[PDB]
């Protein structure tokens, strides 16, 4: 349901959290097929057969069967994506409870988002929204290891400060050690940490789509944990991701307008 508050705050409330999580579980189990097949069963079967770690769902099917979620999706994509991670984890564990050792996580990708913006036109009005876009990869660094649930040795006493989740926005920083009570020079325990693959690509508008008097514009993009090395330089790629501003990128330094960089946490990369 809808109220005066914003969509993001709404979906942050626990009542609608349970509402939409239940709805996602419901159509995951019940949206059978165009022609009565229960396609999610077979998709999950192949997903666990390979241990793909990542499911993908069609936005047309999503919106058509259940449209409230589809409308909410570009507004506050991060929260919806986290909940659908949890719900997909529930359903895959239901189908194969043996999956528990397998990555303890499932990502979910959204395909065929209807409204494609163009890299020339991505303004303030798209921040913190899931957009679809096209381009060509001009650069793609190697796969690097990222912290995802990091444990820290308090190097005053070698207590293992527990596994802190690592959001993409700001680097996690423990306050103090629960044992010796010091905000000490903590340092990462290389082993108990469970890292996550991180790759950084840069897409740009294709010259076939650039206009007459122009320079093609380029947007960064971050691939994480399953999409790394899913695209090489020069690949014409569709990218779907949360156009994003609030990580630490900002020209707060001297000699600069108060002007922010941007990225795209890629949620689906599709070569063409």
């Amino acid at each position: 349901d809808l109220k005066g508050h914003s969509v993001r705050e709404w979906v942050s409330m626990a009542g609608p959290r349970l509402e939409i999580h239940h709805r996602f579980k419901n159509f995951l189990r019940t949206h059978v097929d165009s022609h009565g097949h229960n396609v999610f069963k077979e998709r999950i079967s192949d997903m666990c057969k390979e241990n793909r770690e990542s499911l993908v769902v069609n936005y047309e099917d999503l919106a058509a069967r259940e449209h409230v979620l589809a409308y909410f999706l570009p507004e506050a994509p991060a929260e919806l994506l986290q909940i659908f991670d949890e719900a997909a984890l529930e359903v895959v564990l239901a189908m194969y409870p043996k999956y528990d050792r397998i990555t303890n996580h499932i990502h979910v990708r959204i395909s065929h988002l209807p409204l494609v913006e163009e890299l020339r036109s991505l303004r303030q009005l798209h921040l913190n929204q899931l957009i679809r876009t096209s381009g060509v990869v001009t650069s793609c660094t190697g796969v690097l290891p990222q912290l995802s649930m990091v444990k820290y040795n308090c190097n005053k006493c070698n207590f293992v400060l527990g596994p802190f989740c690592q959001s993409q926005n700001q680097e996690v920083k423990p306050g103090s050690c629960p044992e010796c009570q010091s905000a000490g020079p903590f340092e990462v325990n290389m082993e108990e940490t469970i890292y996550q693959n991180y790759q950084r690509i840069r897409i740009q508008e294709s010259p076939g789509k650039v206009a007459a008097g122009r320079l093609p514009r380029s947007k960064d993009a971050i691939l994480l944990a399953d999409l790394v090395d899913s695209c090489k330089p020069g690949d014409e790629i569709e990218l779907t991701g949360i156009y994003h501003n609030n990580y630490d990128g900002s020209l707060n330094t001297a000699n600069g307008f108060p002007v922010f960089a941007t990225v795209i946490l890629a949620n689906h990369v599709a070569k063409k």
């Binding site: 913190n128 093609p216 900002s250």
Partner: protein, 635 residues
């Protein structure tokens, strides 16, 4: 107790009245009808005409022109009232007001400090354009010593933290954390422009200044255009611009320093809050138009055509003898040289680029070369094309190192990204590049333009950025023969010193021999002396430069077919051309000449704006090539 800016609020009142009561000649409220459209997303500015301002109220117009900076947010809020009262927009959306048709005008030399903070308009050539970004305008902060949120602090073209924490018993001036979601941004592009070539003083480098483009007036400017800008001249704070101490602010509190903490040196400056005040002019473009607009606004451009220009170009197309008429209009100065006139006109119209199913990009542009004895109007033809067309870049020989010739790189001074600075080929993209002293280009860059000619594209990967820049330009080249004078007893490939692949790529080659025939000599002397005696008159361009330029822009988007009869004539005529080749011409005939002939036939169909290339066009194209290719004259 919320002191009110009396003049600014009266301006808000009077301008709101202007918005809601100024009506066009038809009688309807034009700006109500324009404010209707701000309800749409991706639209947050009205474009109010300064002449309308003047007509409705001269007092308010002069007040805005003299106090433009102070009144601007007030006019924006007036528009916010004017639109929110009628329609049910999102409450958070901001709005802007764009002025144009301003009566006065100034120059980048005239933009002196007295013009700071008040409306002013200039012309310029947009050098380069940095990427779009979100810029913070009003920030919401959190004080990290009492966790109180400080609301709605303005950014004066610099990242501004709150000057002191709003809590009285907490004097935090340092530790503030920006709450990004609560803050509001403005879309923002920084562009660099420089003095127009007309306005240069003597011995003066073209000055260049940076122009900021806030929301909705953001991608309108583009590199290479000739744009008028209108807006404020503001000052953006600079720091560490000079190695000599200058003007510095500091608090007027009379504090001293206790022993062991004495307010001296670095501690002293930090305590007093000393900070240099170094500024730099940065124009703040409120609106942007082409300085020489093409129209007052194929089917889309046709709709954009006004009725008068539409019927003008219609009767132009329907005209016969438009061929020689366009020749005369393009080159009233020139006498003779009809082959060069024809080739250059066809070059301006261009061919139809095509591409294969496999992916081979068939060329559509048609490059022309003028080679001849000295003082035969070669550079003059190139200058005519330059001064005539838009997207007509010019360069001469060894005056252009390769980086500026094709493309260069700089880092975004604001962000991490890189700006790919546009070279001559880019600025000539989808147009003409006039290269003079083409024979005297270094190998290092003649190969670069050869790559551009082969692929219509150059990919630059240098200094930390890679990109694939498109350049579909057409090259009009001037080439001096070896020895200074052409030699008709030698082949063209040994008269000039171009690389064989470059010469192959070149579509048309014209030979201009400076023979001494006195009827022609009388003609030329009479022509140029007539011009000098009667400068202003003695020109009979039957269609004005603007007329034919609009005709070119409208004609360009028609893409001819090639009908079967014309194809039969094409193949048989190329066969006849090979029979000629089989005595010998100064430059041999290959399949590339077939390619040239079909592209010129396409360009003649483009001149007549047809959707079918006919045997008339094919015959004329063959005649053009046949007369271009000359028999080497051994004694």
């Amino acid at each position: 107790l919320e002191v009110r800016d009396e003049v600014a609020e009266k301006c808000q009142k009077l301008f709101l009245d202007f918005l809601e009561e100024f009506q066009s000649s038809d009688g309807e409220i034009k700006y109500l009808q324009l404010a209707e459209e701000l309800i749409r997303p991706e639209r947050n500015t009205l474009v109010v005409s300064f002449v309308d301002l003047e007509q409705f109220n001269q007092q308010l117009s002069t007040t805005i022109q003299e106090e433009f900076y102070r009144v601007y947010p007030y006019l924006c809020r007036a528009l916010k009232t004017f639109v929110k009262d009628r329609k049910e927009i999102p409450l958070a959306k901001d709005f802007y007001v764009a002025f144009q048709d301003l009566p006065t005008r100034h120059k980048i030399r005239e933009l002196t400090s007295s013009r700071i903070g008040l409306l002013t308009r200039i012309s310029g050539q947009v050098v380069r354009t940095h990427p779009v970004h979100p810029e913070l305008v009003s920030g919401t902060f959190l004080c990290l010593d009492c966790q109180t949120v400080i609301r709605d602090v303005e950014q004066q073209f610099k990242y501004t933290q709150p000057n002191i924490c709003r809590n009285p018993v907490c004097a935090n001036r340092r530790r503030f954390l920006l709450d990004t979601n609560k803050s509001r941004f403005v879309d923002f592009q920084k562009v660099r422009i420089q003095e127009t070539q007309a306005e240069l003083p003597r011995g003066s480098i073209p000055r260049s200044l940076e122009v900021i483009l806030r929301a909705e007036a953001v991608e309108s400017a583009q590199a290479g255009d000739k744009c008028d800008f209108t807006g404020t001249l503001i000052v953006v704070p600079d720091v560490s611009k000079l190695s000599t101490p200058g003007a510095r602010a500091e608090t007027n509190s009379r504090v001293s320093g206790v022993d062991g903490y004495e307010t001296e040196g670095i501690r002293g400056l930090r305590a007093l809050g000393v900070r240099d005040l170094s500024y730099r002019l940065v124009f703040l473009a409120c609106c942007v138009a082409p300085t020489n607009p093409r129209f007052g606004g194929a089917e889309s451009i046709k709709n954009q055509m006004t009725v008068k220009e539409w019927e003008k170009v219609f009767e132009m197309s329907q005209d016969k003898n438009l061929y020689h008429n366009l020749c005369t209009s393009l080159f009233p100065t020139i006498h003779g040289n009809d082959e060069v006139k024809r080739g250059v006109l066809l070059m301006l119209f261009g061919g139809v680029p095509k591409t294969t199913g496999e992916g081979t990009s068939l060329r559509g542009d048609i490059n022309v070369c003028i080679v001849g004895d000295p003082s035969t109007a070669k550079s003059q033809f190139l200058k005519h094309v330059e001064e005539f067309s838009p997207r007509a870049v010019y360069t001469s020989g060894k005056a252009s190192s390769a980086a500026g010739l094709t493309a260069a790189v700089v880092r975004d001074e604001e962000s991490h990204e890189f700006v790919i600075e546009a070279g001559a080929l880019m600025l000539a993209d989808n147009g003409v590049c006039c290269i003079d002293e083409f024979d005297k280009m270094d190998v290092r860059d003649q190969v670069a333009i050869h790559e551009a000619m082969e692929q219509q594209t150059i990919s630059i990967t240098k200094a930390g950025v890679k990109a694939t820049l498109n350049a579909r330009t057409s090259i009009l080249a001037a080439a001096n023969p070896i020895s200074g004078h052409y030699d008709r007893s030698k082949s063209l490939k040994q008269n000039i010193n171009l690389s064989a692949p470059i010469m192959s790529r070149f579509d048309l080659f014209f030979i201009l021999v400076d023979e001494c025939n006195e009827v022609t000599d009388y003609a030329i002397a009479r022509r140029i002396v007539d011009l000098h005696s009667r400068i202003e008159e003695s020109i009979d361009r039957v269609y004005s430069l603007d007329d034919i330029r609009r005709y070119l822009l409208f004609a360009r988007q028609f893409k001819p077919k090639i009908s079967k009869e014309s194809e039969d004539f094409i193949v048989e005529q190329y066969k006849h051309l090979r029979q000629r080749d089989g005595t010998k011409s100064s430059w041999r005939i290959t399949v590339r000449q077939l390619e040239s002939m079909i592209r010129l036939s396409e360009a003649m169909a483009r001149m007549h704006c047809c959707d079918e290339v006919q045997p008339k066009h094919v015959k004329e194209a063959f005649r053009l090539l046949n007369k271009s290719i000359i028999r080497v004259e051994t004694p």
